[model samples]
Target chain A: DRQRVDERIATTIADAILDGVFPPGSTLPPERDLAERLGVNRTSLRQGLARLQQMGLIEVRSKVNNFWETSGLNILETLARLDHESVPQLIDNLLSVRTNISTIFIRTAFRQHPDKAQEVLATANEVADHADAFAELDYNIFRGLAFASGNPIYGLILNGMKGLYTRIGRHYFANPEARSLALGFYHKLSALCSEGAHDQVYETVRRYGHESGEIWHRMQKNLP
Target chain B: RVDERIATTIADAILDGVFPPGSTLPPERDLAERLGVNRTSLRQGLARLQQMGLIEVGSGSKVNNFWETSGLNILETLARLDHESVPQLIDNLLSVRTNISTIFIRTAFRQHPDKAQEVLATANEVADHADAFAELDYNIFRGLAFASGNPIYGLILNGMKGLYTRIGRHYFANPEARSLALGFYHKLSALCSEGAHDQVYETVRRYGHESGEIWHRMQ
Candidate 1:
């Protein structure tokens, strides 16, 4: 019951922040003064204050509570922090999502860029031996497709973890057992697209994510 | 500015876990007097927080744990944050949607394949009008999520609303995109009608993956 009261105050304040009542860099009234205005004791208001800070909604200063630039986006930062608690589930979840979402993007790109087989084919021989190049190229291909799909949200969403996938890919590359088949996959996908073989491309894109994860796992290292 | 400042101060205090979740707020008069700010401005600021799902407001002010009740709206708010943070958020967002949706489409075809068809009918109707260049481009997935027999997927669809419509504007902008979406929807619809739960789930997974290509074209 006591905790619930604190959360209520916190929720009210959070609503205000999202509503833009306090833009970034703003400061709140003194806690004592604020407490009097809200009608609760200063202590109750103070509880609300601290909780808001924890939420990344604001930054706490000794004499002032400072507003930080915030949005619900902090939810991701928070979730990323929490994702580690269940590594296997996290890995599976990510791979699966990437797989499914990529399907939509790849098919779009297939129709849009049917002539890419030459480019994809040329890149493979070199990418096959070069881990860094392969990792970067693979990411770019998917990301490129993400954008090419004509839906900005797909790219925006994929863009969210551009650096993350790269960083993680490095570990996968180092493992020596990972597929490095990204190039071949791209080659086959490009060919299928050129052939107007939508069904085959669909199957391949669906497999990309799960297979990538399996490829990495077969090499077996501490992923975190 | 004072109102903004006062809001920020209280906001930080409330968010940093000082009060914990579901805490109630004090009365406005006592708070106004103590804060030395006019009651109106203070209320104004508190009102903003209330709307942001930060707290629940009542007679005085009751703060339901925003974290406890808040859903997808919070997702977009943060996904639009700092550039460095956006990518990871995007991935997390897409990732969650992908996993939930595979289940969403499968379940739609399972106990309630009928629900799948029902929603798919909405899909065809809305999408049939896609050339109408209507905003219904989102109806297919929304319907699919609805057919999932899961309330949460529908809520998740709601969460994707902000991003989805924005993307739909680009996706459905072209004639080709319009046709392509219908085909995609039809394929899944066919799978559902066939009572192919595994096929639909697998097909749904493919839908997400093939969705990979539209961004670069936009830039």
Candidate 2:
């Protein structure tokens, strides 16, 4: 061929995506208009746009093709894959991940409304009593923590996976031992928070992760 | 109004016509207008012709024939178009990330023992608190992949960096996710600090899978 037309077209648009000529969260011009603008046939222009999209120059959201600027589900979407075993491991890992947020969220939530702590602890107590309701209780505690944490981001991600943990909790709670172990841990943690026991709650979180992992392990040896 | 086809019909129309080799074809829009077909149908038709090499090459406002040029870019062009039409590309990329990451962990750490200590310290800090370490956790993993002399090291950083950071920013902003990351950091740090590439590899594989599962299925 005398010239590389697709390469030429792909380069120009790659520059545009990189340059924000197509900003994140906004769709690019319709294919026809863009094709006309580039003075390239739709077929050829598509080739270049394909090149750019694959190159991480842009994204397709819904049906709109635009610059990729989200720091949201897309990132989560791109991580590695795991087996059934990794879930409990991940939950154990999450125990530690949420420690700081939990502490801060717990403390801050209590400080702002000391009154809500008792209510939360009671709910925690109720969850332990029922046992099968771990998902409901767990989510609420998680929710309460996120709600109080002064950041809704925690709540949002949790909510996104709310359905996910449903199955997890079901299996996890299947074992009476695991449910028994976590029983009132949330209450204990919350009451400690009500007492403004920041340091204690931190310790609780520390022991909490290890013990939770054990419950997970026991469940694992049996199930996971 | 681009019904969708006009491919072989247009091909038949052209194959029936006589054009020895170099003939200036009409603009696609004009051609579509003349055919009384939807622009969409014409787009599809041209795509068909373009695939058939019955279209023109670069440096011209006009179109041409199969004998007028080389068509290596044809497959490349079509392949790129087909890439993202499905979610499988995302899965494959995720798979690619997992496979490369394991290699990086296994091969990279023994070479750079110091980075392990650094990871451990960061791990400790996150343990003490969760500030969306999920994102940081991933970045550190990506960084470690580079450290390990990843056979195709730059392919990841250079390729997926944009895609990686965006969602990470969101996930990391959450408390529980990082708490989860902190826990892994603790394990990963120890695995590396002791010059345990073998252990590190197993640990990363497990961690990567679960993390991948959560996100891939999350959306």
Candidate 3:
């Protein structure tokens, strides 16, 4: 109960900070006032504060850390669970980061281990057109590609981001055009993949990766 | 209190392969009795493991793939517990870190060449000791990330800070290694001030790769 309550309190305060209620460089109200306002005792409030500190949301000694400047990568997981509307720019920034790394690993996956690429691509044939199936299949394929890249760090990165894609996948894949583009994406990769043309494989993934990223960029703009 | 300790004990057990992935833990009461903890504390610990994506709580607690399901928070724990994987993990980590650092270094210099001064200032003041040098390196990269005009770079770097600092102690232990990084930083700063964005990228990629080599030698 203690841990859970503290976590809840942390989430609530984190929401405020994230929502700009406490804006960057501003201190939280003194501990006593914050504890009183949140209706938690000082001990529970302190525990909650500890969680935020770990997430890089706030510094115990002082001014709220500029979350963008200070928060940990784990905070991205927290952001994923939040209302996307609150952090559109962050979403875009994160997508760019994802895109850059995805291109590298996907290229490496095909270049270094064509057999592993073939294994992952085989599953592409039967993926359902529906959003949920597409989403799950996408995770599986990319996760395979990441590990197959011969760099476990890339896979760990994608694993860390499992939540982001799972949550956002539904909306991104909901459109028929998006699904069509994705299907073509797989077909083209499979073709190049079979030819053993690793250079073309890199170029192909880069082109499709850009196209897919643009789709999300546009969709995010249109998202309510 | 009891919860965290219990969580760590189970996390270690899972990482040690005492309970391999897909294997179910013994029933909660039996496990709790075995560990000399009560059911409530055991439940709290199990909840933490589930939160980490290490285990699933249901009719019984089932372990999951650490590489596929676990979050980045588990990275340090994995590195600490799985000694067999450390060298490869360290190599991979340095490689990716180099890539990520290159991305931001290019962007940061392209956008604000003067920002190189921040890195240059720190580069000129190479610390005399391993831990201090590691901290300096961390600051230089983080400072560049912030100046990169993209928050994601900083967030990503911040997330990896713990592991970076952990491995960096070993990496910066040798004076030659510290001097190598200083050379890279000095060249990078010079390139940035000259408005050589293309050269900046090449320098970062080249030097970063060199740094990766050094990291392996230390291992």
Each candidate: how many clashes? 106, 20, 0
Write down the lDDT that model 2 would get: 0.52
Task: Order candidates by lDDT, high to low.
Answer: 3, 1, 2
The second chain of candidate 1 has a TM-score of 0.65
**Scoring model 2 with DockQ, what do you get?**
0.02
- Please identify model 1 stretches exceeding 4 Å from their true place: A1-80, A84-88, A115-132, B1-103, B107-159, B163-219
TM-score of each: 0.44, 0.38, 0.83
DockQ of each: 0.06, 0.02, 0.42
- Which ranges of candidate 3 are over 4 A from the true structure? A1-7, A17-71, A80-87, B1-3, B22-33, B36-47, B56-62, B116-120
Candidate 1 vs. true structure, TM-score: 0.44
User: How much does each candidate deviate at the interface, measured as C-alpha RMSD after superposition?
Assistant: 10.7, 17.3, 3.7
Ranking by DockQ: 3, 1, 2
**lDDT per residue as tens, model 3, B3-101:** 567877888888788889899999989989988998866766665576566886515788886777764566688788878988877777777777777
Best by DockQ: 3
Candidate 3 clashing pairs, residues 3+ apart or interchain: none
When sorted by TM-score, best at the front, the candidate numbers are: 3, 1, 2
**TM-score pick, better of 1 and 2:** 1
Candidate 1 lDDT over residue span B1-219, tens digit each: 555566555655555555567667777787778778987667656754654456664154666554333444445454444457665555444544555577667767876777667766655555343334335645556667656543334534654766656555655666656666667778877887777777765665666555534432542
